[PDB]
């Protein structure tokens, strides 16, 4: 079923490689793992379009778990401070990064231990994996659509356990906002290379989900939306909304990092801005894109690993 | 003709943007300029397959212009030494001095009966080093280099050019490039990422394969052996491919199969160099010459690379 791991009677183990080559990425297209992924992505998109107008200063859900997953992001956020980067050329993966991940791989299992109540700890090895793989590559010193995909996966797992009763778009907004805060900070500090990047022939170097989320938020208002897709092209306005909206937050981040005229370096986002008249279109289109440009492409999905609990490699 | 320029009767003017969109990238495909590019592409490629084993501490060709141009590369190398970092903001600064001093340096490089040629040359070379303002390098800049050495060829500045010179020249050029990328922290200009051949270069690897192509099975390495870090290291002064793959090897951090899946694929798949070369050319015409993100910024004059039909 696409939505609730059959807790109790369903067993967990360490997830493992399954995507290997071209066919293996395709069999994956029909797996139970994927139908869960696509499902939770739909939900969080649908939800988030309730939150056009999030609380930029929000701090906690009313759901216990969004508050734990909040606080654990918090702990691995404190980790960057404890891991000053290495001097030298701002050009590739900065080496300090291996270290941070060593520290992570050390207290994560502890921090999820505390986070889930007793009865659940037998879920950690599976959970560990996904959260753990959310923040970039352990040894390539990169980060891209594949890990962002892993974080959504973490949450969908926690969700699949039924620990987000009545989760409003504001809870999705809140967890991802911390998530992107952290990933924005990691990419810049560890000076990380893109993974699965399709160059100038892709949406964005590291993200895709941000945009499917941002776009969703203004979906329901399109004409009465504080900005039009045309307008994200205006550095000043994007700034104005970069707290309330993921799409501005995305675009703001490209804009900060990348040096030329926007149209030359982010040609797809440019075309979108200039070609899709309204946000509901962008989101429909950016979802269609996701399921081609991430879910079906190997450089991007091969490090999705499957357990037996949350995201099984069984058929349909 | 693909080969010469009507000197002195074709006229020369500051190049000027011509590729604008999908449409005009497809016209460009029938420009004199493109055939003049394809023509010298082949030339250097077959010449260099003559030179599997070049003198890695050669300094000077026996041709007048290849030392002159060597010397110009050298004059701007030096410019770097006097422009330290904090892409990297010290760099517009370097480009600024390149155009203050470069028309001048090509002044010395040619016979006084030639000065009419600079604005055009000036443009092509002075753009072989990545964008003034975008702070990137990519294969359109590499294609610019070739373009320049082709302008020179087209004024017949290079009689019975040998493989060994098409090395030497290029070998110097990349030496600077590896430097500019690291010292300036230049991003990849116009790239496919993982779905492309190299973040930054395509020609290194055509030349690279040419060289070993004639001897393929008796080549010091075979194409699968680029995947061994130390064998690659042995050859990197003497063979462009290894130099290419060496560069990747010292800059990109994970497994090679993972970060340069395309070069991997080649190496695990294409049995002999001549075929690797054959592929990379076919692929240079799709992936570089027919891709607008990549050629947009190749501007056209009236004299060397003119924007006209056939």
């Amino acid at each position: 079923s696409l939505d609730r791991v059959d807790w109790p009677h369903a067993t967990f183990s360490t997830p493992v490689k399954r995507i290997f080559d071209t066919q293996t990425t395709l069999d994956f297209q029909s797996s139970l793992a994927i139908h869960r992924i696509k499902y939770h992505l739909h939900k969080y998109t649908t939800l988030i379009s309730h939150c056009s107008d999030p609380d930029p200063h929000a701090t906690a859900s009313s759901i216990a778990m969004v508050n734990g997953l909040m606080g654990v992001l918090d702990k691995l956020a404190h980790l960057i401070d404890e891991t000053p980067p290495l001097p030298g050329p701002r050009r590739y993966g900065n080496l300090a990064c291996r270290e941070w991940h060593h520290k992570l791989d050390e207290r994560l299992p502890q921090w999820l231990q505390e986070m889930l109540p007793s009865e659940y700890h037998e879920v950690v090895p599976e959970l560990q994996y996904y959260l753990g793989n959310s923040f970039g590559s352990s040894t390539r010193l990169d980060y891209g659509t594949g890990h962002e995909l892993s974080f959504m996966a973490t949450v969908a797992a926690l969700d699949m356990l039924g620990m987000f009763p009545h989760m409003r778009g504001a809870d999705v907004f809140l967890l991802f906002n911390k998530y992107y805060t952290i990933m924005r900070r990691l990419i810049l500090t560890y000076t990380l290379e893109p993974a699965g990047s399709h160059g100038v022939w892709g949406l964005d170097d590291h993200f895709h989900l941000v945009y499917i989320l941002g776009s969703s938020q203004w979906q329901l208002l399109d004409a009465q939306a504080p900005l039009q897709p045309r307008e994200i092209l205006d550095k000043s306005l994007v700034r104005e909304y970069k707290d309330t909206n993921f799409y501005c937050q995305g675009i703001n981040f490209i804009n900060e990092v990348k040096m030329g005229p926007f149209e030359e370096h982010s040609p797809i986002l440019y075309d979108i801005a200039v070609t899709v008249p309204r946000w509901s279109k962008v989101c429909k289109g950016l979802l269609k894109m996701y399921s081609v440009e991430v879910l079906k492409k190997f450089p991007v999905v091969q490090h999705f690993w499957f357990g037996t609990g949350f995201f099984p490699w069984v058929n349909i | 003709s693909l080969d010469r320029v009507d000197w002195p009767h074709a006229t020369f003017s500051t190049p000027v943007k011509r590729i604008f969109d999908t449409q005009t990238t497809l016209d460009f495909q029938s420009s004199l300029a493109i055939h003049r590019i394809k023509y010298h592409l082949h030339k250097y490629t077959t010449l260099i397959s003559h030179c599997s084993d070049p003198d890695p501490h050669a300094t000077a060709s026996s041709i007048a212009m290849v030392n002159g141009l060597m010397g110009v590369l050298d004059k701007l190398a030096h410019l770097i030494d006097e422009t330290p970092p904090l892409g990297n903001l010290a760099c517009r600064e370097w480009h600024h001095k390149l155009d203050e001093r470069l028309p001048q340096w090509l002044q010395e490089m040619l016979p006084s009966e030639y000065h009419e040629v600079v604005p055009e040359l000036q443009y092509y070379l002075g753009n072989s080093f990545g964008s003034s303002t975008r702070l990137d390098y990519g294969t359109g800049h590499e294609l610019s280099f070739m373009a320049t050495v082709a302008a020179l060829d087209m004024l017949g500045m290079f009689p019975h050019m040998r493989g060994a010179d098409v090395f030497l020249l290029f070998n110097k050029y990349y030496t600077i490039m590896r430097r500019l990328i690291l010292t300036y922290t230049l991003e990849p200009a116009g790239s496919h990422g993982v779905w492309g051949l190299d973040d930054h270069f395509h020609l290194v690897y055509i030349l690279g394969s040419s060289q070993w192509q004639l001897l393929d099975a008796q080549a010091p390495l075979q194409p699968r052996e680029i995947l061994d870090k130390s064998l690659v290291r042995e050859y990197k002064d003497t063979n462009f491919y290894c130099q290419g793959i060496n560069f990747i090897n010292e800059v990109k951090m994970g497994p090679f199969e993972e970060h340069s899946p395309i070069l991997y694929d080649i190496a695990v798949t294409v049995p002999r160099w001549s075929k690797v070369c054959k592929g990379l050319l076919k692929m240079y015409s799709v992936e570089v010459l027919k891709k607008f993100p990549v050629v947009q910024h190749f501007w056209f004059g009236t004299g060397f690379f003119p924007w006209v039909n056939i």
């Binding site: 071209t22 990425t25 395709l26 190997f298 | 993982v194 899946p261």
Partner: peptide
């Protein structure tokens, strides 16, 4: 699916 994978570059070649």
């Amino acid at each position: 699916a994978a570059p070649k």
